[PDB]
Ligand binder design. Structure first.
Ligand SMILES: C[C@@H](C(=O)O)C(=O)SCCNC(=O)CCNC(=O)[C@H](O)C(C)(C)COP(=O)(O)OP(=O)(O)OC[C@H]1O[C@@H](n2cnc3c(N)ncnc32)[C@H](O)[C@@H]1OP(=O)(O)O
Ligand SMILES: C[C@@H](C(=O)O)C(=O)SCCNC(=O)CCNC(=O)[C@H](O)C(C)(C)COP(=O)(O)OP(=O)(O)OC[C@H]1O[C@@H](n2cnc3c(N)ncnc32)[C@H](O)[C@@H]1OP(=O)(O)O
Ligand SMILES: [N+]
Ligand SMILES: [N+]
Lengths: 144, 144
C-alpha cells in the first residue's frame, strides 16, 4: 500500500539557482544531489519532514541533462513548475502489479532506479486525471 | 519555519469522479470535504500520512464552483493536474512576513481561511519558479 507522499518533482531550467531559491526563501537545505542519465535529469532532494511510515517527504528539483528527455520536453512545453508527485510504499513491485490490474498504465515492466538507489515506477498522467504519478520504494527498508 | 509538506492541491473537473479514482486506485479515503465560496472550490482532503512536526500530509482535490475563480481559470487553460503545493508552519503570519521581506509576492495582507479552519496565504508562482505555493497553519495546534 501507498503509505506516504515521498516527494514532489519540480522541473526547473537551472538546478543551482532553484536550489538557492528554496534555501534562501524557506531555509530548506540540500539532502542529496545526483545525476540520473537514464531519466535525463540532474536532481537535488530537499528533505522537508519525516513521515509516520518511517520514511520522509522531499522536494525533488529536476534540471534536464538533454532536451530529448521527459523533463526537457515538459519544460519546453510548460515552463518551470510541478512535474510529478510520488507516493512511497514498502513494495513497489506488488503495488504496481495491483494498479496495472486496474487498467492504469504502468510505464515500466519492472521498477527502475530512482534517487538514492530507490526503486521507482510511473503511472501515465492521462490515466491519473492529469497527474504524472510515481511509486517509490526506498533502498533503505524504513521502520514504521 | 516551514516544517512539513501540508498538501498537494490537484485541480479536477469532477470532484466525485476524481475522489473515486484515488479511492479505487490507491485505497485513499476522504478525510474531509467542504466548499470554500471565497476561493471558489469544492474540495476533498485525502490524508496520506502523519508528519514529524505533529501535522499531516494530504491530497487536496479541487473542483471549481465557478469559471471566474483561480481553479476555474487554471483548469480552462491547463486541464486537470497539480495546481499548487502547500507547506505547513506553526506561524503562518510570521513566516509570510519573513518571505514578504525577501521580495517574494505574498498574495494576502493577512492569512485567509483554508480547509478545516486553517489559516492560509499564497506566494505568487512567478516568484517561486512556476509553483503556486501555499503556507498553512492548522487550526488545531499540533504537537511535534
Ligand atoms: C529519477 C526519478 C527519481 O525518483 O529520482 C524521477 O523522478 S525521474 C523524472 C523524469 N522521468 C519521467 O518523468 C519518466 C516518466 N515519464 C514519461 O515516461 C513521459 O514523460 C510520459 C508520461 C510517457 C509522457 O511522454 P510522451 O512521450 O507522451 O510526451 P508527450 O508530451 O507526448 O505527453 C503525452 C501527454 O501526456 C501529457 N504529459 C506529459 N508529461 C506530463 C506530466 N509530467 N504531467 C502531466 N501530463 C503530462 C502531455 O501534456 C500530453 O497530453 P496531451 O494528450 O494533452 O498532449
Ligand atoms: C482553500 C485553500 C485551502 O487550503 O483549502 C486552497 O488551497 S484554495 C485554492 C484556490 N485558490 C487560489 O489558488 C488562490 C491563489 N491564486 C491566485 O490568487 C491566482 O490564481 C494567481 C496566482 C494570482 C494567478 O492569477 P492571475 O489573475 O494572474 O491568473 P493568470 O492566468 O493571469 O496568471 C498569471 C500567471 O500566473 C501563472 N499561474 C496562474 N496560476 C498558476 C498556478 N496555479 N501555478 C503556476 N502558475 C500559475 C499563469 O500561467 C500566468 O503565467 P504567464 O505570465 O506565463 O501567463
Ligand atoms: N521523482
Ligand atoms: N491548498
Amino acid at each position: 500500500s501507498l503509505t506516504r507522499i515521498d516527494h514532489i518533482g519540480i522541473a526547473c531550467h537551472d538546478l543551482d539557482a532553484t536550489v538557492e531559491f528554496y534555501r534562501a526563501t524557506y531555509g530548506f537545505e540540500v539532502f542529496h544531489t545526483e545525476v540520473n542519465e537514464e531519466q535525463g535529469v540532474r536532481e537535488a532532494m530537499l528533505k522537508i519532514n519525516d513521515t509516520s511510515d518511517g520514511g520522509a517527504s522531499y522536494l525533488q528539483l529536476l534540471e534536464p541533462t538533454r532536451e530529448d528527455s521527459a523533463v526537457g520536453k515538459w519544460l519546453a512545453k510548460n515552463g518551470e513548475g510541478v512535474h510529478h508527485i510520488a507516493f512511497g510504499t514498502a513494495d513497489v513491485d506488488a503495488d504496481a502489479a495491483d494498479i496495472r490490474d486496474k487498467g492504469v498504465r504502468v510505464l515500466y515492466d519492472e521498477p527502475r532506479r530512482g534517487s538514492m538507489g530507490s526503486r521507482i515506477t510511473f503511472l501515465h498522467p492521462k490515466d491519473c486525471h492529469g497527474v504524472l504519478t510515481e511509486l517509490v520504494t526506498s533502498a533503505a527498508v524504513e521502520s514504521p
